[PDB]
Amino acid sequence: RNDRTLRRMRKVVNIINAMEPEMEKLSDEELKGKTAEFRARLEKGEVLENLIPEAFAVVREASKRVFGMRHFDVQLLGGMVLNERCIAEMRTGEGKTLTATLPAYLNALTGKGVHVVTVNDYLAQRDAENNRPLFEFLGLTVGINLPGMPAPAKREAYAADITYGTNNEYGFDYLRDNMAFSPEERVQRKLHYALVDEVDSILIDEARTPLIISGPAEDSSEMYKRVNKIIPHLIRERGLVLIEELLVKEGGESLYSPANIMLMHHVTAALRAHALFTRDVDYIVKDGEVIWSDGLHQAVEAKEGVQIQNENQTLASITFQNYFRLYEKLAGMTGTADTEAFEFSSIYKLDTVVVPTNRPMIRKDLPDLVYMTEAEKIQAIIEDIKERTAKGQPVLVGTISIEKSELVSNELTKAGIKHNVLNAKFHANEAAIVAQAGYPAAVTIATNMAGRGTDIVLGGSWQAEVAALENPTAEQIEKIKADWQVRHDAVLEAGGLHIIGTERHESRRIDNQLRGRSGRQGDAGSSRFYLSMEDALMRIFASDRVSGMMRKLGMKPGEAIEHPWVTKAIANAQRKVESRNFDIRKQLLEYDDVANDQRRAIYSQRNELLDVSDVSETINSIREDVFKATIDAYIPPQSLEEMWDIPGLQERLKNDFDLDLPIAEWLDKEPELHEETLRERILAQSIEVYQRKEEVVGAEMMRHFEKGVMLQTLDSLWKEHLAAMDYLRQGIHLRGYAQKDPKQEYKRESFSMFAAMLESLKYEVISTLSKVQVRMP
């Protein structure tokens, strides 16, 4: 890791820089042609990574001509990092935007597409539109993906060499591609390269945010009707023994758990709407309706024979994490937050890299200061502000709440320090203050600072000064720049922006984001964090004496020392809280792996179906398994004749497979028969009746109706399964309790239920193709 991979990349950077004159000599057309040359070399078997130096140099030259921007060495380093499965930490102002142009080019060369993942659509459109001329200069096409975009335009967007889009719409496009009924319906290609704009939020904070496609269901009016057909048998354990037995329908064992809940909230409702809601008494039936709660309304409609009011359910679901783990290559960017490299490597095998700034980082991060009380802390803070503003140095003070901002505001005013508070209610004022936030001695209080935030220009923004002018002359802009130079230089001499944190937050990342506001692009700066024994943060030592021992080092109302071990102790606490968080996270991700693997498995199988034209083989093969398994249920393999249930098999075949065979007559006529030949008879009859229907309809039509039925049934059982899993998982605050562990039983019932779903899949597919009505000559 380390400078170990950084010096490797610096070596390459030297090669790229060394390449510059070469690239300066080439024509526009020769630069354009480079892409084709690289692609020809890749086709002829060159390793992409070997092209990094040249390709980057080409891109940089292209940017020099097109944008008039020459990527810095560190941008090249970042681009090289982003070629790996790595997270690139790039300080604010280091031009994450421009840097990202490099690995997009490089990973487009293989001709398999690039997905640039933005935080929102505006940036996707902006970056796409702004970068379009660069990549066309180098003979590549750029796509933009938006929610609500027509499928052909989405297809166009994904078929372009480099695509820009948001995280969400990519995920929804995946779900929709995995709801397609033909491969031409797909919008995406094979998921090749994903570059994610803010991985802190997107891959960590939003890791578990579900992306969901919902719809009106379909499988209403079913389960309900069959559950309804069972209850009127019942009279005022038995009843329960009788109920479970009476499912020559859904489900050895055993409604009651863990899965067969569905059935429970389905039954207690059959039942519950029979003696519990009296017919024309508690409600009325008018105009095909019942005129409720928990499946109970739908049951009444099943009982009274009404149209059941089928209603939204989840059709498709995925977390960001589980979607992005599908890409062949994955990379991302963030602000100097990170702190979680090992987490990214654990969860994603993403190594993270701190990319050095173009100019040196010269912010002085001073040691944390600790006081007995809030009041003394505040006093020291006031004193610090007073000293630095006395030097002409501007200050940004960060607080943890509006009340604290007010508190410090009042105190500063009490001390005669002019300042402005940034109030979330007043956006115009915020922008107006931030314009002057870096003016000599300016003092600004911010509450729970957002993230990255508007650059605060040291000495003020002269650019806002001209944007202010009514009718800007030439010599006004000289007075302005000259004055600005002096202010900027004076502020730089006074030490740049000072950052004051009045508390530390429970999460240090917030502190790092506050602190990140100073020292940008090599500007001078400093930071200081202050703490007290009555800070919220000083609660996490869950012990009054313990925290109360620090009071014996004394502090002396303003005669403090600084103990560099305190800062380490504090950082250690916060990294232990973070470790605690990660332990919890890993546990939750262990639960997520079940559904993730289930989805992955089912979608792999679904796409196997989708990718093939002709499902004959699969049909025949699962036909064998289904009928074999089905006969086995009435004729146990290698058992005696007295165990056979022929009426059961004749009813089951007629009812579920529309196949009326004289098996009783077969057995009683030839004592020659034997199982295998009976199984072959049934098979042969089903086959010939089916091939007859094919001869009625045609081959092509059979292949395509087969596919459709496979997919429809797959989808329907999947959506049902998602819901069963949903109820199962949410049910786990009453199922796993007294002594025995929850989880583990969960994975068992998940696997059991998923297995059940695949065999039911086979059964229902074959049943459907066997029951489909054709007018037989």
Author numbering: 13 to 248, 276 to 290, 295 to 334, 349 to 834
Show passages lifted from the paper.
SecA is an evolutionarily conserved and essential ATPase that is required for protein translocation in bacteria. The catalytic core of SecA (amino acids ~1–832 in E. coli) contains five domains: nucleotide binding domain-1 (NBD1; amino acids 9–220 and 378–411), the polypeptide crosslinking domain (PPXD; 221–377), nucleotide binding domain-2 (NBD2; 412–620), the α-helical scaffold domain (HSD; 621–672 and 756–832) and the α-helical wing domain (HWD; 673–755). In addition to the catalytic core, most SecA proteins contain a relatively long C-terminal tail (CTT; also known as the C-terminal linker [Hunt et al., 2002]), whose function is not well understood.
SecAΔMBD crystallised as a symmetric dimer in a head-to-tail configuration. The resulting models suggested that the PPXD was positioned considerably closer to NBD2 (i.e. more ‘open’) in SecA and SecAΔMBD than in SecAΔCTT (p=2.0×10−5 and 1.1 × 10−7, respectively). However, disruption of both the MBD and the FLD results in a protein that behaves very similarly to full-length SecA, indicating that the FLD mediates these effects. We propose that the MBD is the key for unlocking this autoinhibited conformation in the full-length protein.
